[PDB]
Motif scaffolding. Structure first.
Motif, PDB file in Angstrom:
ATOM      1  N   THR A 152      -6.803   7.695  17.417  1.00  0.00           N
ATOM      2  CA  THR A 152      -6.029   6.881  16.461  1.00  0.00           C
ATOM      3  C   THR A 152      -6.763   6.765  15.122  1.00  0.00           C
ATOM      4  N   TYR A 153      -8.069   6.529  15.194  1.00  0.00           N
ATOM      5  CA  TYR A 153      -8.856   6.302  13.989  1.00  0.00           C
ATOM      6  C   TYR A 153      -9.139   7.605  13.239  1.00  0.00           C
ATOM      7  N   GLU A 154      -9.246   8.721  13.963  1.00  0.00           N
ATOM      8  CA  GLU A 154      -9.362  10.046  13.347  1.00  0.00           C
ATOM      9  C   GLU A 154      -8.113  10.372  12.534  1.00  0.00           C
ATOM     10  N   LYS A 155      -6.943  10.055  13.094  1.00  0.00           N
ATOM     11  CA  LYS A 155      -5.679  10.244  12.400  1.00  0.00           C
ATOM     12  C   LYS A 155      -5.629   9.370  11.150  1.00  0.00           C
ATOM     13  N   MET A 156      -6.026   8.112  11.302  1.00  0.00           N
ATOM     14  CA  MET A 156      -6.061   7.203  10.163  1.00  0.00           C
ATOM     15  C   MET A 156      -6.984   7.715   9.063  1.00  0.00           C
ATOM     16  N   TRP A 157      -8.161   8.222   9.431  1.00  0.00           N
ATOM     17  CA  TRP A 157      -9.038   8.827   8.427  1.00  0.00           C
ATOM     18  C   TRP A 157      -8.381  10.030   7.731  1.00  0.00           C
ATOM     19  N   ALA A 158      -7.745  10.906   8.503  1.00  0.00           N
ATOM     20  CA  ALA A 158      -7.090  12.063   7.892  1.00  0.00           C
ATOM     21  C   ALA A 158      -6.016  11.602   6.899  1.00  0.00           C
ATOM     22  N   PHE A 159      -5.295  10.548   7.274  1.00  0.00           N
ATOM     23  CA  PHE A 159      -4.277   9.982   6.388  1.00  0.00           C
ATOM     24  C   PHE A 159      -4.879   9.439   5.094  1.00  0.00           C
ATOM     25  N   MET A 160      -5.898   8.599   5.220  1.00  0.00           N
ATOM     26  CA  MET A 160      -6.563   8.025   4.041  1.00  0.00           C
ATOM     27  C   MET A 160      -7.116   9.107   3.137  1.00  0.00           C
ATOM     28  N   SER A 161      -7.741  10.111   3.747  1.00  0.00           N
ATOM     29  CA  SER A 161      -8.340  11.218   3.010  1.00  0.00           C
ATOM     30  C   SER A 161      -7.278  11.966   2.228  1.00  0.00           C
ATOM     31  N   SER A 162      -6.159  12.246   2.886  1.00  0.00           N
ATOM     32  CA  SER A 162      -5.086  13.016   2.263  1.00  0.00           C
ATOM     33  C   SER A 162      -4.412  12.299   1.095  1.00  0.00           C
ATOM     34  N   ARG A 163      -4.582  10.980   1.028  1.00  0.00           N
ATOM     35  CA  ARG A 163      -3.960  10.145  -0.011  1.00  0.00           C
ATOM     36  C   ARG A 163      -5.057   9.363  -0.758  1.00  0.00           C
ATOM     37  N   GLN A 164      -6.264   9.932  -0.831  1.00  0.00           N
ATOM     38  CA  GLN A 164      -7.474   9.183  -1.232  1.00  0.00           C
ATOM     39  C   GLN A 164      -7.313   8.446  -2.565  1.00  0.00           C
ATOM     40  N   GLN A 165      -6.594   9.071  -3.494  1.00  0.00           N
ATOM     41  CA  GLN A 165      -6.458   8.521  -4.849  1.00  0.00           C
ATOM     42  C   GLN A 165      -5.909   7.091  -4.846  1.00  0.00           C
ATOM     43  N   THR A 166      -5.068   6.790  -3.858  1.00  0.00           N
ATOM     44  CA  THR A 166      -4.452   5.477  -3.749  1.00  0.00           C
ATOM     45  C   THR A 166      -4.866   4.758  -2.470  1.00  0.00           C
ATOM     46  N   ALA A 167      -5.089   5.510  -1.395  1.00  0.00           N
ATOM     47  CA  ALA A 167      -5.424   4.891  -0.098  1.00  0.00           C
ATOM     48  C   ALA A 167      -6.801   4.241  -0.120  1.00  0.00           C
ATOM     49  N   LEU A 168      -7.743   4.891  -0.793  1.00  0.00           N
ATOM     50  CA  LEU A 168      -9.082   4.339  -0.920  1.00  0.00           C
ATOM     51  C   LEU A 168      -9.168   3.588  -2.226  1.00  0.00           C
ATOM     52  N   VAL A 169      -9.357   2.280  -2.134  1.00  0.00           N
ATOM     53  CA  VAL A 169      -9.267   1.399  -3.295  1.00  0.00           C
ATOM     54  C   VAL A 169     -10.656   1.090  -3.859  1.00  0.00           C
ATOM     55  N   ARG A 170     -10.711   0.743  -5.138  1.00  0.00           N
ATOM     56  CA  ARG A 170     -11.995   0.584  -5.820  1.00  0.00           C
ATOM     57  C   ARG A 170     -12.845  -0.523  -5.220  1.00  0.00           C
ATOM     58  N   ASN A 171     -12.183  -1.617  -4.863  1.00  0.00           N
ATOM     59  CA  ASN A 171     -12.848  -2.822  -4.378  1.00  0.00           C
ATOM     60  C   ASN A 171     -11.819  -3.692  -3.684  1.00  0.00           C
ATOM     61  N   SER A 172     -12.263  -4.779  -3.057  1.00  0.00           N
ATOM     62  CA  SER A 172     -11.329  -5.605  -2.285  1.00  0.00           C
ATOM     63  C   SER A 172     -10.270  -6.281  -3.146  1.00  0.00           C
ATOM     64  N   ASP A 173     -10.592  -6.609  -4.403  1.00  0.00           N
ATOM     65  CA  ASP A 173      -9.591  -7.195  -5.306  1.00  0.00           C
ATOM     66  C   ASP A 173      -8.400  -6.251  -5.514  1.00  0.00           C
ATOM     67  N   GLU A 174      -8.684  -4.982  -5.795  1.00  0.00           N
ATOM     68  CA  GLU A 174      -7.620  -4.011  -5.994  1.00  0.00           C
ATOM     69  C   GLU A 174      -6.897  -3.798  -4.665  1.00  0.00           C
ATOM     70  N   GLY A 175      -7.649  -3.817  -3.566  1.00  0.00           N
ATOM     71  CA  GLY A 175      -7.040  -3.686  -2.237  1.00  0.00           C
ATOM     72  C   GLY A 175      -6.041  -4.788  -1.932  1.00  0.00           C
ATOM     73  N   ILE A 176      -6.436  -6.030  -2.179  1.00  0.00           N
ATOM     74  CA  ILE A 176      -5.542  -7.170  -1.937  1.00  0.00           C
ATOM     75  C   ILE A 176      -4.323  -7.122  -2.851  1.00  0.00           C
ATOM     76  N   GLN A 177      -4.539  -6.797  -4.121  1.00  0.00           N
ATOM     77  CA  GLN A 177      -3.404  -6.665  -5.033  1.00  0.00           C
ATOM     78  C   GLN A 177      -2.442  -5.589  -4.558  1.00  0.00           C
ATOM     79  N   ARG A 178      -2.984  -4.502  -4.011  1.00  0.00           N
ATOM     80  CA  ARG A 178      -2.145  -3.412  -3.511  1.00  0.00           C
ATOM     81  C   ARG A 178      -1.295  -3.876  -2.326  1.00  0.00           C
ATOM     82  N   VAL A 179      -1.891  -4.684  -1.451  1.00  0.00           N
ATOM     83  CA  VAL A 179      -1.162  -5.284  -0.323  1.00  0.00           C
ATOM     84  C   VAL A 179      -0.013  -6.153  -0.826  1.00  0.00           C
ATOM     85  N   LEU A 180      -0.296  -6.964  -1.842  1.00  0.00           N
ATOM     86  CA  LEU A 180       0.687  -7.921  -2.333  1.00  0.00           C
ATOM     87  C   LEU A 180       1.832  -7.267  -3.090  1.00  0.00           C
ATOM     88  N   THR A 181       1.550  -6.160  -3.775  1.00  0.00           N
ATOM     89  CA  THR A 181       2.498  -5.547  -4.719  1.00  0.00           C
ATOM     90  C   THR A 181       3.192  -4.266  -4.235  1.00  0.00           C
TER      91      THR A 181
END
Ligand SMILES: N[C@@H](C[C@]1(C(=O)O)C[C@H]2OC[C@@H](O)[C@@H](O)[C@H]2O1)C(=O)O
Length: 256
Positions: A152-181
């Motif tokens: 499950t987690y290998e698949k999740m990593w492949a997903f995050m990697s494939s969408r890294q520009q948006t899936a991997l966020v700069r910091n938790s503030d940007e992460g939380i804003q992404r969740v909210l918006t």
């Protein structure tokens, strides 16, 4: 007098935050939080003063293909700082390159999202194709997924990697804003989920904890301070001071 110790740290609520002020603040007075209180306590026990310096690249630290590190971890490896005092996760890959103190807090990775979906677990999240998800770039949560041998987690990593520009966020503030918006779930440490979900009632944890681990103070390998810091942490643990500090900084029930 003993040399003033350089402390590398990073902004992360409620560990390290800018103090509210009607006037400009300077030096250590700019900051407050659990980790600042921890530093006041540790420095009393060990007999030092210190200079708090935000990590220039704003990262916790991860290694690339060649084994080059960044973030607070790199600051320690390169002896740019004496201590890293932050919610810095104690991990196998990091312990090989820096010396961690014993843990001052425990936590595990879980999922932060908005309310109202049938998603109840990492399995559910990985399987569905409606919501994006990811983690803070170059921290231990990202590395957990990158290193996982669990399907499950290998698949999740492949997903995050494939969408890294948006899936991997700069910091938790940007992460939380992404969740909210946007339709995005953030893989996040449980202590931070506990903090945010008692403050923003539109946010919720999904599922349980997927691992268990601790935060420690980082020092460069061979540091003459690590063992003294460990002893001080155990003192604070046993005296109930760490528990008191957690209660002080975690706001307590604000949401149903
Ligand atoms: N503690 C992590 C950093 C981070 C994470 O990878 O989850 C980034 C930041 O993300 C939100 C929350 O998990 C907080 O504890 C922080 O943890 C680390 O030491 O790398």
């Amino acid at each position: 007098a003993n040399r003033t110790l350089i402390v590398t740290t990073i902004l992360e609520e409620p560990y390290v935050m800018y103090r509210k002020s009607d006037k400009p603040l300077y030096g250590n007075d700019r900051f407050e939080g659990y980790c600042l209180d921890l530093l006041k306590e540790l420095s009393n026990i060990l007999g030092f003063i210190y200079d708090v310096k935000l990590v220039p690249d704003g990262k916790y630290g991860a290694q690339n293909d060649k084994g080059e590190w960044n973030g607070m971890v790199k600051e320690l490896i390169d002896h740019r700082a004496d201590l890293a005092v932050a919610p810095l996760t104690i991990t196998y890959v990091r312990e090989k390159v820096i010396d961690f103190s014993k843990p001052f807090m425990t936590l595990g990775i879980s999922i932060l999202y908005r309310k109202g979906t049938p998603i109840d677990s990492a399995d559910d999240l990985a399987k569905q194709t409606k919501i994006e998800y990811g983690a803070v770039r170059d921290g231990s949560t990202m590395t957990f997924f990158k290193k996982s041998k669990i399907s499950t987690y290998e698949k999740m990593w492949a997903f995050m990697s494939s969408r890294q520009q948006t899936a991997l966020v700069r910091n938790s503030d940007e992460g939380i804003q992404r969740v909210l918006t946007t339709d995005y779930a953030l893989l996040m440490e449980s202590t931070s989920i506990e903090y945010v979900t008692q403050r923003n009632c539109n946010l919720t944890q999904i599922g349980g904890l997927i691992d268990s681990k601790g935060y420690g103070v980082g020092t460069p390998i061979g540091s003459p301070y690590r063992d003294k810091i460990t002893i001080a942490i155990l003192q604070l643990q046993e005296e109930g001071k760490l528990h008191m500090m957690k209660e002080k900084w975690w706001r307590g029930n604000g949401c149903p």
